[model samples]
Target: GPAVGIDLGTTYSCVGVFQHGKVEIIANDQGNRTTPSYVAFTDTERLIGDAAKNQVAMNPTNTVFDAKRLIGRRFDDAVVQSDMKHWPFMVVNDAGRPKVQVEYKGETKSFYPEEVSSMVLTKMKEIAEAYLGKTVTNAVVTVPAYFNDSQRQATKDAGTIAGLNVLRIINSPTAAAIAYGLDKKVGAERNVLIFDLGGGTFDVSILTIEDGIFEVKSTAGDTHLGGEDFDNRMVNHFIAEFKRKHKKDISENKRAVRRLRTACERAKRTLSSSTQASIEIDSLYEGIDFYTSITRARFEELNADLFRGTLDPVEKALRDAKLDKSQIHDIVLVGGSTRIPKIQKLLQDFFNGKELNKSINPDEAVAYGAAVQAAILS
Candidate 1:
């Protein structure tokens, strides 16, 4: 029997399997490890992952990611409203359900969150199908630890739509513990904190291991805070900088804002290494010179408020877990956003000079944990 593990994430997805007493990541047919959590549907075919993500550079409206932020929530979700200002796509009220309106090739299409996420899930299923050389059925899919019943049910529904037999829907923090516990062989008597910051969600979970049982003491997070928030902050800053240089304010126009927002996202990635990055917006305003350069320090300053958003949850997690920094045996960082130097420094300072472990590739650890669960099932 061949079982698989799927980490169906907001910004990306990955599959893994436990084979021969070791976890093996089942790369997609394209030989990529993590698939972009993106989807695009055209008259010809439905494209997912990298192919769909590529469309963001060309057709920013059609490709969708971060649908997890909207899953099982009403349009009235206050957090969603705060986050909506940054998204390029329009969200409209359609009868009762919130609809995502995407424009591509002169056509406007509307989608619900489930339909969008199912596309990504289906892509993972295809990869598993190829890797197993047979139909891959059962899987343990992970969701955010703080997800309520409605959110969890939607995730399971997405699995059904993707043609997956979801054996269990595990919380991300628990999955991380499974992987960390097994890797360190830190049996039944260790207290650990797992800090996860992914593309769309952030979580801090404190867990205790006793006699092979893993118990989650507490969890806290803001589902809308992560890499996407960082990108949006960078986007807005570039818009203001552009206005200052060109003597034209674009903070009001929706379409223009979207164009500049997309450009800012590109510029942010460039600044990861370079000191200064430029933004060139050819479509936002025709025949207008809309370009500006922003240094990394300037970008960080612009997003400092957004970056500060995660700290409150960390403090709450510590309080709820009823433990002080001195009691924590280890702090493991998970998720791609933790790669940022500033974020690493923040964690180090919070832990009072305690070493934060980055042994596992933050991006792939959840899927690897899922694979371990698949092994247990087999």
Candidate 2:
């Protein structure tokens, strides 16, 4: 009876297992290491992950991405009000909570935020089940360290709906520290600063490891700050550029915007590794083939303010922990957004001006730690 670890992230997800003395991140049927946190309702089928994302261009209005934003939040919350407007799908109000209404198999159906997140959790469970070759049920799910009580409980509700007995819910950044801490368990006291900036959420935490205890001393960050925001900024920059070049107004074009957004998203990732990346879309508004390339320098320029702002939370965490900057031993980058070189340098520059610990796997560290915790629990 092995337990699994699930990192149910905002834009992507992973399931890990501490099986037979080794930690493993289970890949889905598509032969991919991590899955998209996207779900789509089709004419007759319910799709998740890449399958759900692939159809988003054609089925924009039904593809539910980033439902985590609404989890345990009210419909009238300013963040929910603003975030929903960008998505192709419709977010409707239910009492005070939010739900997504989509047309599925010829009928309009609505799902609570937890329900949509549950679908994603269920997919992770399925991926784990297939790899394990048995019906897997127990797991340790990791969430943002900054998530409030309601947010944590909502995530637990999602696991319950996914047919999982969620044994524990751990903080994501703390989980990353756990993964790293366990590797160095024989060492003495160590202080780790966990900086997590993912697709749709950002968190900074101070975790201390001394002997047998691995504890998070402080956590802080905004729920609205992340990679997707950078993508949107990139998308808008190009959207305006498109208008400037073609004399066309695609500001309200959902299909073209989604396509452009998708391209911008990929290009954002590309810029992380490459100095420049191109965005190309055929038949993008009025059958106009659009192509453009952006430099990593410029992409960083676009997000300079946001990148600089990431330190705000680290400062706050330091303030809360009552620790000086020199006290931090390692700065572990936890989320996918942390892959941005600008952020890496910014964090380094903020701390020691030269040193940092890049996340072992920006995508899998939290899941890996969750698996370790699952092993510890089970």
Candidate 3:
């Protein structure tokens, strides 16, 4: 049997196995290293990962994405209250806790956040089992560094529900730091800053490492900020544009909103490397086509506040860590959202022109680090 690491993310999930002193990411049956953290239910079948994600536009009510943001939260939590307006899926209160309600076939059922996360975790476990050719059980899972005790416990419960021994719940940024420190062979005692902006959450942690031991000095983040928020900004831009031209609000239309979301995500990724990207959606609203060219500058202007929102956490983390920027030996970037050019530039400028280190793949670093920890435990 082999021990593996799981990066259970808000947008995508990944699994990695440690063997012969190296960590190898295990690709899913779809031959992808990362799988969308989505689930959809039908009368006779349950869909996970890519299958669920692909059907979201058509079956918005039954497809659940971004379940991470709801884990361990109460229904009355301001965050959950705000999230209700953005998602088409039904969310109901069960004894004050938030639960997802979906209509599958002819029956309506409700599920907890842990249950939804377990489905994604089970998919990761299956991927590892297929790759290692054995029944792998023990694993380390990574969570946002800022996750509270309840959130961490919820993640562990999800792992258990997935039928795996949850060996440990590790901090995501700490895991990334371990991966980077081990890769670079950092020997001296030093301070490192990890900026993690993922699909649905943002976290920044300051760590001190000495003699191969990692210590988290401070952490700060907004549970609601991430890549998905960036995509939403784009979506809103298109929606406002459509309303201006056609005098119709498609925000209430689940299918139309999903289509625009899909297109916005693509354009956001395209804008990462190119100055301009096009968002084109056919029949986006009542047989009318929606098309627009967005320049990186315009996109940044539209999302200026959201972009600046990430920095408050960074400043708070530094203050909590009690260290000046010059004292930090290295700045590491993690998460899919770090690929955005404006985000990169903002960090560079904030750190006095210090070049950001990206030696580890932003998407896989946390999982790789978790694997390293699992290997040590084994």
Best candidate per TM-score, number?
2
Encode model 2's per-residue lDDT on 3-60: one tens digit a residue. 9999998889998999777889889999887899999998899999999998888988
Q: Is candidate 1 or candidate 3 better by lDDT?
A: 3
Worst 10 residues of 2 by lDDT: 178-187
Model 3: CA > 4 A from native: 73-86, 95-97, 182-188, 243-249
- Candidate 1 residue-wise lDDT, 85-147, digit = tens: 877677776665677887645577888787778788888888888877788878889998778
Cα displacement (Å) at residue 243, model 3: 4.5
Q: How many residue pairs clash in each candidate?
A: 0, 0, 0
Question: Candidate 3, which ten residues in sequence have the lowest lDDT sum?
Answer: 178-187
Error of 1 at 168 (Å): 1.7
Rank all candidate structures by their lDDT, best first, as comma-separated numbers. Answer: 3, 2, 1
TM-score of every candidate: 0.81, 0.91, 0.90
